[PDB]
Design a protein around this ligand. Structure first.
Ligand code: SAL
Lengths: 50, 49, 49
């Protein structure tokens, strides 16, 4: 692909109820959210992707 | 009594409220004394201000 | 009060009523936003804090 900006993610752990807010260079916020959630073992509503 | 030093008395606390209908689902918490959802995190200092 | 010269007890019972609603009509409005994600978990958002 050679997108000038390579892959990048910033994940912010709140410390409450497994909550996490992520800033990601992605075309798929949904999958990023569910995939992060699945790996963590928390409901999808705990993950916010921006 | 004017010569008596302050004496704390024994506390007494009673709360009265109504129970929910006998046939109300265990998952329907409306009317039940459910603790504040963030209370555990507030007690642990994890709640973020 | 008859048995005490320098200490007295008082007792009072009072009622109260409080009108419910912003007295500014247009403030009596509320909104909510709800998302159900594919895992079935729900995320509720509303105007209150
Ligand atoms: O209680 C009200 O009537 C009220 C009205 C406007 C703004 C804040 C308020 O609490």
């Amino acid at each position: 692909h050679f997108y000038l900006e390579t892959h990048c993610t910033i994940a912010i752990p709140k410390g409450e109820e497994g909550e996490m807010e992520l800033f990601v260079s992605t075309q798929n916020a949904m999958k990023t959210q569910s995939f992060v959630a699945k790996m963590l073992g928390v409901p999808v509503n705990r993950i916010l992707v921006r | 009594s004017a010569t008596l030093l302050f004496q704390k008395d024994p506390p007494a606390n009673i709360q009265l409220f109504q129970e929910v209908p006998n046939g109300q689902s265990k998952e329907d918490t409306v009317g039940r004394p459910l603790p504040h959802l963030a209370a555990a995190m507030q007690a642990s200092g994890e709640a973020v201000y | 009060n008859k048995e005490n010269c320098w200490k007295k007890r008082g007792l009072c019972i009072i009622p109260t009523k409080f009108g419910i609603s912003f007295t500014v009509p247009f403030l009596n409005q509320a909104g909510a936003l709800i998302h159900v994600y594919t895992d079935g978990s729900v995320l509720v958002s509303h105007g209150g804090t």
